[PDB]
């Protein structure tokens, strides 16, 4: 029996502490703690509704764009504004491209070093490594020559005795199962991923005006002036430039990221039977394409007790059943008001009192949906799409399964997706489907401009009396996001963000029910309590973002 702390958890966004009780070499109980707070909800209070998005975008720079978009959607909701369709196309392209960058960086820069041993890569034969990928990928940068150059970069780094961010990593740990060759392939793909993510953010920059932190939104649409014949504005040349970057993303995503995902499963199949965080899942529909903030390209819904057959579809961001279900509690959080609160009536009154295992131990609130704990994020969004019978999602998952089949002789069933690896797989599927979103929305924009619609913005009015409530939903890279705005006498009288990492990372709730991170860890085998790699493997699968979780 023993108690460990993992603080800081690295290769995430933000400040996270994980505690675990280990008994008989398996985690028996866990605590997740967000250890930094800013009070972003209070900072934005009393301001003009139109200004909120620029301030609350700074909740997070990893998921940049997301809080900006949710905030404008919340104001638009409160005010009953229908966004111009061109503004939806532009918002959608930004979100999709951003998410592409986000997911690639998560799989490679954040998560790969849980599964990949760089010391072992030094012992690889580059030709054998390349040979392994024959018939498995058509990627044009898996040659022995590429792998040799990468191996030499590792050789030289190790030679210098300055390992920096690769130092004191978990090399030779018993839970590292990849052969030398596969470790080398992964490091090469790690480096290649950085080129691809750069291209995805060039898309974002050309519409956003920069990234991180886009600056082209407004309550009422966007600030991009569409004029094909205009100097200095969003003309056909600038649109061609955007398209040239959208076109560069697919090959890496399809031939490297999608494949590596199938491969990590093939070598680590035990991780398909651990890391279940919840039995309930929620996602919201995303990428509206009509003139009335609807006709989403991706579906949403609610799954209860893992039953896809009886899930409830969510097709509208104004769905009262979704709106009325959401509450947050601070019983085991460092805030004063503990009973579950609907976010329009939410408070965020800090009440720090140090760590207690049975008391308050986190700046993260505890969200519930009709009193239940729910997992959000790519696992949720894939399961909902499978529930909806979405052919694109079925087909993409099947491609991953077929690679896994080929390598192992085994298949993957839906039951195995409720796991650390299923979570990773849902993220990869999402990144893949997002490339079609980009192509679809670019084409829609070009077509609409060609019909003579250059409208991008409708100037809002905000009544100087009255109290109005609005909620902006967004399917972010880490899951369902919502910003909740109350306007009274023209200014923001309450602002509450309920963020996807809040749902997943949040501590024990009003009824002391365990959140997804904490739940997912029960049962985790830990070969060495001083180097708890297995715990971090599961926690990374959720893509924690603690500036998001706490704000």
């Amino acid at each position: 029996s023993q108690r460990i702390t993992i603080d800081p958890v690295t290769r995430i966004q933000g400040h996270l502490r994980i505690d675990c009780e280990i008994e008989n070499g398996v985690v028996s109980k866990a605590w997740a703690s967000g250890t930094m707070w800013r009070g972003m909800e209070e900072i934005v209070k009393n301001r003009d509704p139109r200004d909120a998005w620029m301030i609350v975008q700074r909740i997070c720079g990893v998921c940049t764009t997301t809080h900006a978009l949710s905030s404008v959607r919340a104001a638009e909701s409160a005010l009953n504004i229908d966004v111009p369709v061109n503004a939806q196309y532009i918002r959608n392209i930004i979100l999709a491209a951003h998410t592409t960058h986000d997911h690639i960086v998560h799989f490679y820069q954040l998560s790969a070093l849980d599964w990949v041993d760089i010391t072992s890569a030094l012992q690889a034969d580059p030709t054998k490594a390349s040979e392994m990928l024959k018939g498995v990928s058509t990627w044009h940068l898996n040659s022995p020559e590429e792998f040799t150059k990468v191996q030499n970069k590792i050789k030289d780094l190790v030679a210098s005795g300055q390992l920096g961010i690769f130092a004191n990593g978990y090399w030779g740990h018993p839970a590292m199962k990849l052969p030398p060759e596969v470790n080398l392939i992964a490091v090469a793909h790690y480096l290649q991923a950085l080129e691809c993510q750069r291209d995805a953010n060039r898309v974002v920059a050309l519409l956003g005006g920069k990234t991180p932190h886009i600056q082209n939104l407004a309550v009422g649409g966007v600030a991009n002036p569409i004029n094909l014949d205009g100097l200095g504005v969003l003309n056909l040349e600038r649109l061609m430039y955007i398209k040239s970057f959208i076109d560069k993303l697919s090959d890496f995503v399809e031939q490297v990221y999608k494949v590596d995902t199938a491969v990590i499963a093939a070598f680590y199949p035990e991780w398909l039977t651990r890391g279940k965080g919840a039995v309930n899942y929620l996602s919201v529909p995303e990428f509206p394409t009509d003139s009335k903030n609807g006709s989403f390209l991706f579906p949403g819904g609610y799954i209860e007790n893992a039953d896809l057959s009886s899930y409830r579809p969510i097709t509208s961001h104004s769905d009262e059943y979704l709106i009325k279900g959401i509450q947050e509690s601070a019983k085991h959080s460092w805030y004063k008001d503990e009973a579950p609160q609907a976010p329009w009536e939410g408070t965020t009154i800090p009440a720090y009192d140090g760590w207690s295992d049975d008391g308050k131990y986190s700046w993260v609130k505890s969200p519930t949906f009709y009193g239940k704990t729910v997992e959000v994020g790519p696992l949720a969004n894939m399961l909902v799409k499978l529930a909806a019978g979405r052919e694109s999602t079925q087909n993409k998952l099947n491609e991953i399964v077929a690679i896994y089949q080929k390598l192992t002789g085994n298949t993957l069933e839906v039951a195995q997706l409720h796991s650390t690896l299923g979570r990773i797989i849902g993220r990869t599927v999402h990144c893949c489907e997002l490339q079609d979103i980009l192509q679809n929305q670019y084409s829609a924009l070009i077509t609409n401009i060609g019909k003579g619609d250059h409208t991008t913005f409708v100037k809002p009015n905000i009544p100087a009396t009255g109290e109005f409530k609005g909620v902006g939903f967004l399917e972010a890279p880490r899951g369902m996001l919502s910003h909740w705005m109350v306007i009274k006498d023209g200014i923001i009288s309450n602002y509450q963000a309920v963020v996807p990492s809040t749902w997943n990372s949040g501590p024990r709730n009003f009824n002391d029910d365990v959140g997804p991170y904490e739940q997912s860890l029960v049962g985790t085998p830990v070969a060495d309590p001083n180097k708890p790699l297995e715990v971090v493997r599961t926690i990374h699968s959720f893509d924690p973002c603690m500036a998001c979780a706490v704000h």
Binding site: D7, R50, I55, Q109, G164, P212, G230, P350, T456
Partner: protein, 267 residues
């Protein structure tokens, strides 16, 4: 041997680190493999928990007097620093401990440079700038939310290649990036001069690329290089060029204080 760098995040959103992933000269991969030895950075470190804090302590000892310390985020001082706790201690203490042995110290971003968004409004956590936390040290300020990453990387490069910081203004900002008002080097100045103003997004003047002063542009009161260096190295990309006014995110008392549409004072 590469020059050592220790990066510590306080009340950060990670946007300042994320700027590095857009950089091209050097790219992040060339930064960490060729330009510097990144001895501590929680976003990319293989090691976690006990192992990473050991990396840091060892590096602080091994590279005493040689490393560049970088901080993003504001430092919260209220209630004895408990608004940011890492390995059970206030970040302000980690930062002061690392600052003791630093060859140079850099506040990357508006949050660390002057408090930024985290310190705005009522300042719930008593957030302050890096320089406020280190009164006896010269802190180089690279503001912006986030800055163009080369405002940082060419500052570090000047330190490595020529052995001293770049030339700094009276806020300790490098003159190559922050030496001039955006409005004193803005390609829309001709429209400002002629009274050619966008009045609302999507209007005819807006769709001709006119000046954004009457939309709330803060270029008149914001020092920076957004109109010249711009962003992302693709050509033509900064907020005004895309159609939105500057918000003043670089500049204390402007960004996160004034409304988007509130008009700037013109000199």
């Amino acid at each position: 041997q590469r020059p050592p760098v220790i990066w510590i995040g306080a009340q950060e959103c990670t946007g300042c680190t994320e700027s590095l992933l857009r950089a091209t000269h050097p790219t992040v991969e060339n930064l960490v493999l060729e330009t510097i030895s990144l001895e501590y950075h929680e976003v990319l470190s293989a090691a976690f928990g006990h192992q990473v804090e050991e990396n840091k302590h060892n590096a602080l000892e091994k590279y005493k007097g040689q490393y560049v310390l970088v901080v993003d985020g504001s430092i919260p001082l209220k209630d004895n620093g408990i608004y940011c706790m890492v390995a059970g201690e206030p970040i302000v203490d980690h930062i002061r401990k690392a600052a003791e042995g630093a060859a140079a110290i850099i506040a990357i971003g508006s949050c660390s440079a002057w408090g930024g968004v985290a310190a705005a409004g009522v300042n719930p956590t008593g957030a302050v700038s890096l320089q406020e936390v280190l009164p006896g040290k010269t802190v180089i300020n690279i503001p912006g939310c986030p800055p163009n990453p080369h405002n940082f990387l060419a500052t570090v490069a000047h330190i490595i290649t020529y052995g001293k910081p770049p030339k700094l203004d009276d806020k300790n900002r490098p003159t190559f990036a922050y030496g001039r008002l955006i409005h004193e080097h803005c390609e829309r100045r001709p429209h400002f001069d002629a009274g050619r103003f966008a009045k609302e997004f999507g209007d005819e003047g807006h769709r001709e690329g006119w000046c954004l002063y009457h939309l709330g542009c803060k270029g008149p009161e914001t020092y920076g290089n957004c109109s010249t260096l711009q962003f992302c190295d693709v050509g033509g990309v900064w907020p005004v060029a895309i159609g939105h006014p500057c918000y003043g995110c670089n500049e204390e008392g402007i960004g996160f204080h004034k409304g988007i549409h509130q008009l700037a004072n013109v000199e």
